[PDB]
Design a protein around this nucleic acid. Structure first.
Ligand SMILES: Nc1ccn([C@H]2C[C@H](O)[C@@H](COP(=O)(O)OP(=O)(O)OP(=O)(O)O)O2)c(=O)n1
Ligand SMILES: [K+]
Ligand SMILES: [Mg+2]
Ligand SMILES: [Zn+2]
Ligand SMILES: [Zn+2]
Ligand SMILES: [Zn+2]
Ligand SMILES: [Zn+2]
Length: 865
RNA sequence: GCCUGGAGCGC
DNA sequence: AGTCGCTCCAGGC
């Protein structure tokens, strides 16, 4: 024979132009060059695979009545061969009788049955999905794609080594890869698992734009990029994260670079290529991308902005070889991230803004906010305006260029900090999907793939692909809180992986629960564990192991944050598995199952409450799978004893389900359902402990309340949960607010603490009631005013100003720069004292005796009415 | 209070 | 394009 090893990373198909063909992209070892290079494997002749379901008794399609003659596979085969194939234009085909299982939403389909599996070129016509005949009642697979077929049949679950037997050469090169090969049939490709993974080539880049003097155009004038040629995803990120880099700068048109600039660059020795025109800069960039040939391009706000600006300028400046940004040689450039995901076809795009949204929470996910929170450093901002002025002098252009470089380095460090790539790989190996898609975010598709693999593996027919809202079933139970402040220790118990455990504990699966608004019946405790509980069980074990590691002997603060991020990521994947059950658009939609799971949950929470009560214990709160108990005790060791005592009494009633001590609070301020604050006990040595404050649902934690309101609100909480007597406190509070009020008026407050943030659900142009929505208004401005443009999903920052236009506060919203820049605009102190600070402090103090709404208004010097 | 619209916390 | 439960605010009536 003849065979070659190849490590795949990305896949792609163009069902319209090249049906039955799937392009794979990855790495191949070149011994002579002692290094891995990019490789493109084109897999052809992936055949459509259909399953025909035979009728019990034959039927006449002209009369619509039975005939008395039973059916046999030969009956079906012949019909397909004589009537179906011929009628639909299917020249050749192969077929065979197989036994498959079913357990999905199509009625009239038996659990197990014999089917006639048919296969034929994806180049020949597609049969209708609702096709039926004399010998067969239904046909599955009619529309399966080549890629899904390929990934499933060869059992490819994420990046891995493949062996390609009998590789062919290609008349002409189809990609921008070093190597290429072609397989004539998918069974030539095979997964092997005894060869370690190769390191990847990572490239992190950043760019700068500038609005042109006359014409309205966002011209790219600077790009920076860092590169690492041996970045391994099965170990710590390299230190440093890059080995090389490059910068490139160009002049808008009319401008001229400061002179000596050339020499200034030679002087300080900076790997900075200075382009004459934007077209040259774009040409230079693509050239570096092609030469560096990165397997992963990483940046910030790639999908939402950068990628689109880049492709358009590339089209405008008629730059050479746009497809080099991807790995597939193309001709026509698609636009709008679909047209985008295809543009970079073959290279995985990793957007830290997207990855961050998925892994951690922030008030905004803009780069500055991110560098601050994750890297713990400040990031200078260079406003589009200040840019022009920088071309006048050498040092300034040189500074801007260095600034672009720093963003690329930040983006790269943030990526390594959250540990995005290794996590993305791990998840992709678990779901069996495509890693570039995992990096785009979303839980649904990963779930779908995880299940598809599981069912193919178990010999099941799987549903065909088909082609915030209001709840559609009962959710979790939230107990009514006994609101107030608490001195004595509070006991918080929470079930471990509740829903996933409920699914296993009762063996809930598409294969064990009868269904068709009604809650189905728990299946016979006799039946065997279904596919769903098995897969779910696996995700829960992975998580436990990662939690086990965390428990470990003295670890790095940074490494411990990663384990925690990973652990929650696995938690999310398990819950999304439950969720997709109730996801109308899901391919494995089965509302009844979702409904039956949440049902048992509320039932279990009820019984857990009632039980804790029979033990003569005080239950002050509860949320879906938790119980809060007021021990009324001051003896910690005794509390813990009571805790493990109640734990034991609960776990005793279930096979898998396990409740545990989630925490113990020294003091607790319980305001409303899903809203409380607390000092959390953290034991040390000799029954001694440290305490840490924790917030849940308060306004202080939300993004849509200025920091001025939030910082003050946190002060109040700090005091409330304190040791000090109620008196000392109420005084300190009053003392503080009165001061806050004075400062807000004497203009001592930093303009930033006045910013309010809100994310847009839709693009600013899609809102009808516009004008009265401060965030929508300020976005419309930013948009129609300069470069970058705010779209759905972005958070908008704004402040309320004094226009001198007697409009409502909601209609006097401005950008922070629009304020600091303009003179007729000034901060509406009235608004902030009464609609921001007052509401927050009022809601917090609501249960505190001594404080009250009217009183809080007088401290801030407002008129109590 | 309802209604409409807008927020994003909590599981 | 995982689920549902629970406040919050602008504004008209
Ligand atoms: N994003 C989420 C969070 C929670 N839940 C549901 C399923 C969980 O089982 C239940 C309880 O929420 P938890 O935060 O307690 O999650 P678990 O109990 O399952 O995990 P843990 O062991 O951390 O408590 O709520 C969900 O569907 N989606
Ligand atoms: K009060
Ligand atoms: Mg739990
Ligand atoms: Zn081999
Ligand atoms: Zn919980
Ligand atoms: Zn709404
Ligand atoms: Zn109102």
């Amino acid at each position: 024979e003849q065979v070659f090893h190849f490590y795949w990373l990305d896949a792609y198909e163009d069902q319209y132009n090249q049906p039955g063909v799937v392009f794979l992209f990855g790495k191949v070892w070149i011994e002579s060059a002692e290094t891995h290079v990019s490789c493109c494997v084109m897999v052809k002749n992936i055949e459509r695979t259909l399953y025909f379901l035979p009728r019990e008794m034959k039927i006449d399609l002209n009369t619509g009545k039975e005939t008395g003659t039973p059916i046999s596979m030969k009956d079906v085969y012949e019909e397909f061969d004589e009537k179906i194939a011929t009628k639909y234009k299917i020249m050749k085909f192969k077929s065979k009788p197989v036994e498959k299982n079913y357990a999905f939403e199509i009625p009239d389909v038996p659990e197990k049955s014999e089917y006639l599996e048919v296969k034929y070129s994806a180049e020949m016509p597609q049969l209708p999905q609702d096709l039926k005949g004399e010998t067969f009642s239904h046909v599955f697979g009619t529309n399966t794609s080549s890629l899904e077929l390929f990934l499933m049949n060869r059992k490819i679950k994420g990046p891995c080594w493949l062996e390609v037997k009998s590789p062919q050469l290609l008349n002409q090169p189809v990609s921008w890869c070093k190597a290429e090969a072609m397989a004539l049939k998918p069974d030539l490709v095979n997964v092997i698992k005894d060869v370690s993974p190769p390191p990847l080539v990572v490239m992190a880049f950043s760019m700068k734009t500038m609005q042109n003097a006359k014409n309205h155009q966002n011209e790219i004038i600077a790009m920076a990029a860092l590169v690492h040629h041996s970045f391994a995803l099965d170990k710590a990120a390299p230190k440093p994260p890059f080995q090389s880099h490059f910068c490139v700068v160009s002049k808008p048109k009319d401008c001229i670079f400061p002179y000596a600039f050339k020499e200034v660059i030679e002087k300080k020795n900076v790997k900075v290529e200075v382009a004459a025109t934007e077209r040259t800069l774009l040409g230079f960039f693509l050239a570096k991308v092609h030469k560096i040939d990165p397997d992963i391009i990483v940046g910030h706000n790639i999908y939402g902005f950068e990628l689109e600006v880049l492709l358009q300028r590339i089209n405008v400046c008629k730059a050479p070889h746009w497809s080099k940004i991807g790995r597939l040689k193309r001709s026509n450039m698609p636009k709008l991230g679909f047209g985008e995901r295809n543009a970079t076809c073959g290279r995985m795009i990793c957007d830290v803004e997207i990855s961050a949204k998925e892994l951690i929470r922030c008030k905004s996910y803009h780069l500055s906010e991110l560098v601050q929170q994750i890297l713990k450093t400040e990031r200078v901002v260079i406003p589009m305006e200040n840019i022009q002025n920088m071309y006048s002098e050498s040092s300034q252009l040189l500074y801007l260029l260095e600034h672009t470089w720093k963003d690329a380095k930040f983006i790269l460090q943030i990526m390594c900090e959250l540990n995005v790539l290794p996590l993305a790989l791990q998840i992709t190996n678990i779901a069996g999907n495509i890693m570039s898609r995992t990096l785009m975010g979303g839980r649904s598709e990963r779930n779908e793939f995880l299940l598809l693999h599981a069912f193919y593996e178990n010999n099941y027919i799987v549903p065909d692909k088909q082609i915030r809202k209001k709840a559609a079933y009962a959710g979790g139970l939230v107990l009514d809180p006994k609101v107030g402040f608490y001195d004595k220790f509070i006991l918080l118990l929470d079930f471990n992986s509740l829903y996933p455990s409920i699914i296993q504990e009762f063996n809930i699966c598409f294969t064990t629960v009868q269904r068709v608004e009604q809650i189905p019946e728990l299946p016979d405790p006799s039946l065997e564990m279904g596919i769903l509980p098995r897969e779910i069980r696996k995700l829960v074990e992975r998580r436990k192991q990662v939690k086990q590691l965390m428990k470990q002997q003295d670890l790095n603060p940074d490494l411990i944050l990663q384990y925690d991020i990973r652990q929650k990521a696995l938690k999310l994947t398990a819950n999304s598995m439950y969720g997709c059950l109730g996801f109308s658009y899901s391919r494995f939609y089965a509302k009844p199952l979702a409904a039956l799971v949440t049902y048992k949950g509320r039932e279990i929470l009820m019984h857990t409450k009632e039980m804790v009560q029979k033990m003569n214990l005080e239950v002050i709160y509860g949320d879906t799978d938790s119980i809060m108990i007021n021990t009324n005790s001051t003896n910690l060791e005794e509390v813990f004893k009571l805790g493990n005592k109640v734990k034991s009494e609960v776990n005793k009633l279930y096979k898998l389900l396990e409740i545990d001590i989630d925490g113990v609070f020294k003091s607790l301020l319980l305001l409303k359902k899903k809203k409380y604050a607390a000092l959390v006990v953290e034991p040390t040595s000799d029954g001694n402990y440290v305490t840490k404050q924790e917030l849940k649902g308060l306004d202080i934690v939300r993004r849509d309340w200025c920091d001025l309101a939030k910082d003050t609100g946190n002060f109040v909480i700090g005091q409330i949960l304190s040791d000090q007597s109620r008196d000392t406190i109420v005084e300190n509070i009053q003392k503080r607010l009165i001061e806050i009020g004075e400062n807000v008026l004497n203009g001592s407050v930093p303009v930033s603490q006045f910013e309010i943030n809100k994310a847009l659900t839709k693009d600013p142009q899609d809102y009808p009631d516009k004008k009265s929505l401060p965030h929508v208004h300020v976005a419309l401005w930013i948009n129609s005013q300069g470069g970058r443009k705010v779209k759905a999903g972005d958070t908008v920052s704004y402040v309320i100003c004094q226009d001198g236009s007697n409009l409502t506060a909601s209609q006097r919203a401005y950008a922070p720069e629009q304020l600091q820049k303009q003179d007729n605009l000034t901060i509406d102190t009235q608004y902030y004292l009464a609609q921001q600070i007052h509401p927050v402090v009022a809601r917090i103090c609501e249960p505190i005796d001594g404080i009250d709404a009217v009183l809080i208004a007088t401290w801030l010097g407002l008129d109590p009415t």
